């Protein structure tokens, strides 16, 4: 099959005129198949999501969203670690990257975290990360 890299690179190409579901859904399929799929996926996603190129970052979030809905407990657990969530917090927070990221990207992330605290209540670290952003008045 195609590697996670090859998948994610197609799925988030800033050259895409529209969303590439073959690549997006193939990424999810592939991380679910591979033993160390989920931890690699989460590393590749964080980087893409932190891109200065908005359409790369927005596509990457769409991948994140998609696979969170379709996969996981292995995937759900990787995303529910601070190792990953910190990279999101960096994006949405003025202290860090927040000042040079669009409202669109940051609002998308905040939305996603919320949706997770509700659909995945056992992933208590996501809720920790969300309540921390709320207490700081980032949410929203």
């Amino acid at each position: 099959p195609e590697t996670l890299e090859a998948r994610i690179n197609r799925a988030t190409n800033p050259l895409n005129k529209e969303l590439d579901w073959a690549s997006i859904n193939g990424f999810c399929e592939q991380l679910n198949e591979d033993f160390e799929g989920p931890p690699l996926a989460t590393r590749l996603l964080a980087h893409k999501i932190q891109s200065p190129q908005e359409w790369e970052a927005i596509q990457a979030l769409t991948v994140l969203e998609t696979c969170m809905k379709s996969c996981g407990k292995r995937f759900h657990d990787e995303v529910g670690k601070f190792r990953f969530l910190n990279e999101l917090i960096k994006v949405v927070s003025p202290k860090y990257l927040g000042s040079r990221t669009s409202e669109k990207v940051k609002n998308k992330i905040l939305e996603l975290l919320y949706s997770w605290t509700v659909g995945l209540p056992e992933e208590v670290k996501i809720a920790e990360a969300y309540q921390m952003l709320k207490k700081q008045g980032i949410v929203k």
Binding site: K81, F82, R83, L85, N86, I89, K90, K125, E128, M132
Partner: peptide
């Protein structure tokens, strides 16, 4: 086995 929560 995990980072600390980033404040």
């Amino acid at each position: 086995s995990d980072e600390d929560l980033l404040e």
